[PDB]
Structure 1
């Protein structure tokens, strides 16, 4: 099996997509009909990630400075 590489240094880009990044993979197996699982943690830096970004994006923050994208994200 393969695990992602995720570092503290990791550019927030990689960070924010990084699970969504992760998604495309197993679509191999499941889409291959092969079966798979994956770990999920609370990465949760993601919000200041995609979000602090959004500040850069000038974007309007949601609660806890974070928009409902979590839902969307989730």
Structure 2
């Protein structure tokens, strides 16, 4: 634990925060990466980020693609 950070985003969090959590972890890791340190990141349940993004896009009335998932 003296060499790792935990970025938690439970299921009762809004879809914006679940969509943003991998990017928060990635910026956190990129800091050490550009400070000449080796980093390792693990996005557990990335499909949950895609589902949170799909929810945010459908609520914004963005037109859906395959399986209501946005084109992007």
Normalising by the smaller structure, the TM-score range is: 0.7 to 0.9
Give the match for residue 18 of structure 1: 21
Structure 2 residues without counterparts, runs of 5 or longer: none
Q: Normalising by structure 2, what TM-score?
A: 0.80
Structure 1 SS opposite 2:69: coil
Which is bigger in relative contact order (C-alpha 8 A, separation at least 6)? Answer: 2
Give the match for residue 31 of structure 2: 28
Q: Normalising by structure 1, what TM-score?
A: 0.78
CA displacement, residues 14-47 of structure 1 (integer Å, 9 cap, x when unaligned): 1001101211111111110111101123331223
Pick one of 65, 69, 72 that aligns with 1:66. 69
Q: State the Cα RMSD in Å.
A: 1.4
Q: Which runs of 4+ in 1 moved over 3 A?
A: none
CA shift, 1:62, in A, is 1.4
Count residues with an aligned counterpart.
69
